[PDB]
């Protein structure tokens, strides 16, 4: 029936949101970042890395080595304090939406989520 159409659509909508929101591992609060470093401080007091989403205890989690502009760190593979994940997450969200709309076309002879 139409109930399955709703169930599929909302599951995609919630996956699209999961790609964007960072949930605090301590308290479960949904977070997003306006600007700044990737070291987040939740209102519960716990810190987290905005990139890998793990709980952390300070700036030691991140690569703190000098870098050459346009090059990755040659001393470690740690999360970067400065890189903005927005574009990568938007690309994931848009591929999910694109594929989902193609699936609903196959199923039901319509867009999902906000337009581009």
């Amino acid at each position: 029936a139409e109930k399955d159409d709703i169930k599929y659509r909302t599951s995609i909508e919630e996956k699209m949101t999961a790609a964007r929101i960072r949930k605090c591992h301590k308290c479960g609060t949904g977070l997003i970042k306006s600007e700044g470093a990737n070291r987040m401080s939740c209102r519960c007091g716990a810190q987290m890395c905005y990139l890998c989403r793990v709980s952390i205890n300070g700036y030691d989690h991140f690569c703190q080595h000098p870098r050459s502009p346009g090059a990755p760190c040659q001393e470690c593979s740690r999360c970067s304090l400065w890189t903005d994940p927005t574009e990568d997450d938007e690309k994931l969200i848009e591929e999910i939406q694109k594929e989902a709309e193609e699936e609903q076309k196959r199923k039901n002879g319509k867009r999902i989520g906000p337009p581009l």
């Binding site: 709703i6 659509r9 909302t10 995609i12 909508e13 919630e14 699209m16 949101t17 790609a19 964007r20 929101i21 308290c27 479960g28 609060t29 949904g30 977070l31 997003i32 970042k33 306006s34 600007e35 700044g36 470093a37 990737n38 070291r39 987040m40 401080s41 939740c42 209102r43 905005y50 700036y59 997450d89 938007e90 969200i93 939406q97 867009r111 999902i112 989520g113 906000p114 337009p115």
Partner: protein, 76 residues
């Protein structure tokens, strides 16, 4: 039209709305239910932030969709 809203903690509530309603109006309903001041509310739907002056229909928010209340923080 019925939609859902998840609070900061993850508790889910239910609102009756219309797709022509504005984001401000939806925030007023959230205030009626949970007492959260609208200026403390920041809403996400399907990965996108909902902006004052827009309507639910601007973001293709349909029946049984879920809006998420989040904190917008500055990194260190």
């Amino acid at each position: 039209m019925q939609i859902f809203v998840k609070t900061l903690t993850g508790k889910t509530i239910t609102l009756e709305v219309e797709p022509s309603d504005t984001i401000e109006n939806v925030k007023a309903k959230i205030q009626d239910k949970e007492g959260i001041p609208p200026d403390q509310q920041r809403l996400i739907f399907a990965g996108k932030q909902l902006e004052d002056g827009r309507t639910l229909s601007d973001y293709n928010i349909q029946k049984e969709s879920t809006l998420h209340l989040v904190l917008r923080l500055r990194g260190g």
